[PDB]
Design a protein around this nucleic acid. Structure first.
Lengths: 142, 59, 187, 71
RNA sequence: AUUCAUAAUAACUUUUCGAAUCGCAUGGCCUUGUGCUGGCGAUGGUUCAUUCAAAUUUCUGCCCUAUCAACUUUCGAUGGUA
RNA sequence: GAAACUGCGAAUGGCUCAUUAAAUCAGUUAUCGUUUAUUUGAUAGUUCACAUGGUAUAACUGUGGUAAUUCUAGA
């Protein structure tokens, strides 16, 4: 997350062309969108230089379906974190509950910066990878 | 061996019972579509030329 | 044949999956095209729902777009010099999407002379009216005009020859151009 | 050098025979396909004989500066 | 919620489609010729929508075992770029 | 109106429970990530002889092959 052109291909937004003939403001043409459902576009998504094809604000994905909440338990991956959701399962014979949990891998854009123990709210997208089906949309801790 | 010979101008056809193996030996080592002269297989078919269109072997 | 289903891989925890089902047809895959250059040969593939798909082998020419001029011309392909995915893919002179390639550049300078009247490298009043009307636009950039003096341009293939059958691309301009020449100059 | 030019004359008379042959044999869907491969059938031959007589004439921009001009 | 629907440009295509098909009733106009128009249907046909579906897919839930405590990554495991 | 060409159907139904332990399945979502014969409703004045253009071929006739198959050859 220190340079933009690290990889072998040229990272650029698709079908967003800055004309070398003209010379105007807005140094690179940066396309962005609001994901909806009251989710705020971060300012560093508008002002940033990362590309991230799978970003919910600057990339080619959409948020629809479930909205989940979790606590980040692993973050050392490249643009992916692993969160944990905890809940109680109810046994009706003993008339009482037990603690269960699920680990969800979720893709993280450079617009957010999260650590271990952060609470994040995520939204469901199309399959990003083998296991990633969600994308983090709002960080609400420190 | 049997020779199913057809004349397409008149559209007629007849099988010939042929014996005396060195008469039909001239048909050997020839391909389908190659033409063959008539007097080598028989002086009754002299002057004629035929085209090999195929056939059936044993079984 | 080539399968595309996720039931044959391991689980996220690392466990083996058992054989639950035979290979269904709707999860099939096919062999790569490996499109070379010269002496065009497109075959047809019958796909799901009909929907014929063009597998291109050994394509020769293609439609390349000049984005800053907003035009596009049918130009031939000389050869691939850089590929971000594999260097053997360069070595076998194969054409895929996003392959850096050299084009012939003659009809582009024909159009430039017809539209602007200036020459690269180094009559009627309607033509003078067009050229005076199209002033302050023959100042494209130094890199592409020096490429024009060289006689070949660097273009990036923007089409998939495997699925579409065409080899279409666009001429490199600006920051992306400089990045690819910085990559291919490394020796 | 004259025999090579005679072979070139044989080459382009065979070429115009080719041109007339699959310009007459074409259909409406297939005419637009052959015309380019008429011109393509011209093109390398239009090159080839030339470097051939360049052999008879033989008988008798780097990427570094391309980076550097931006500076 | 979109680089959506859609539109306009420069073109491009081993170029797709844009009816040489069939049955009943046979009618109106006259410059009266097999002249011109003309009904009810059948079949086919490009694209969009609908329906009958299909394929992937979110969350949560499965019986007995630790005399199974570590498993997965040779040659795919988990993720990124192409 | 037999035969045959063409067009559909034969991927429905019926049977069985061997495999299979987050696999199938149940309730619940999504396709802003796709295919879709058939219906149903819309939808082409723009095209390298047009009182309508070309070619084979089955069915058929006739000659046959092998012990034999829902086998087939030549004309």
């Amino acid at each position: 997350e220190l340079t933009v052109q690290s990889e072998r291909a040229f990272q650029k937004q698709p079908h967003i062309f800055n004309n070398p003939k003209v010379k105007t403001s807005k140094r690179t043409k940066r396309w962005y969108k609001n994901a909806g459902l009251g989710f705020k576009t971060p300012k560093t998504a508008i002002e940033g230089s990362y590309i991230d094809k799978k970003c919910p604000f600057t990339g080619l994905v959409s948020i629809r379906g479930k909205i989940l909440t979790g606590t980040v338990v692993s973050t050392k991956m490249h643009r992916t974190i692993v969160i944990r959701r905890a809940y109680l399962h109810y046994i009706p014979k003993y008339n009482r509950y037990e603690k269960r949990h699920k680990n969800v891998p979720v893709h993280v854009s450079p617009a957010f910066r999260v650590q271990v123990g952060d609470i994040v709210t995520v939204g469901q997208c199309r399959p990003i990878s083998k296991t990633v089906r969600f994308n983090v949309v709002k960080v609400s801790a420190a | 061996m049997k020779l199913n010979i057809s004349y397409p101008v008149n559209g007629s056809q007849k099988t010939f019972e042929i014996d005396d193996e060195h008469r039909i030996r001239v048909f050997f080592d020839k391909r389908i579509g190659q033409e063959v002269d008539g007097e080598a297989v028989g002086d009754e078919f002299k002057g004629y030329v035929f085209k090999i269109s195929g056939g059936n072997d044993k079984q | 044949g080539i399968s595309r289903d996720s039931r044959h891989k391991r689980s996220a925890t690392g466990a083996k999956r058992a054989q639950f089902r035979k290979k269904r047809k709707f999860e099939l895959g096919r062999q790569p095209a490996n499109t070379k250059i010269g002496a065009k040969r497109i075959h047809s593939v019958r796909t799901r729902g009909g929907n014929k798909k063009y597998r291109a082998l050994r394509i020769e020419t293609g439609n390349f777009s000049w984005a800053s001029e907003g035009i596009s011309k049918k130009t031939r392909i000389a050869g691939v010099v850089y590929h971000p995915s594999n260097n053997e893919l360069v070595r076998t002179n194969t054409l895929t999407k996003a392959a850096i390639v050299q084009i012939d550049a003659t009809p582009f300078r024909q159009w430039f002379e017809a539209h602007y009247g200036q020459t690269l490298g180094k009559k009627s009043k309607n033509a003078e009216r067009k050229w005076a009307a199209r002033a302050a636009s023959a100042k494209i950039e130094s890199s592409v005009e020096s490429q024009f003096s060289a006689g070949r341009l660097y273009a990036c293939i923007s089409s998939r020859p495997g699925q579409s059958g065409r080899c279409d691309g666009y001429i490199l301009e600006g920051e992306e151009l400089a990045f690819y020449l910085r990559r291919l100059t490394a020796k | 050098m004259e025999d090579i030019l005679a072979r070139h004359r044989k080459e382009n008379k065979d070429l115009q025979n080719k041109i007339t042959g699959m310009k007459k044999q074409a259909t409406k869907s297939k005419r637009k396909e052959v015309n380019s491969k008429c011109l393509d059938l011209q093109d390398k031959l239009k090159t080839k004989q030339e470097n051939e007589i360049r052999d008879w004439k033989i008988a008798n921009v780097t990427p570094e500066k391309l980076l550097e001009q931006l500076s």
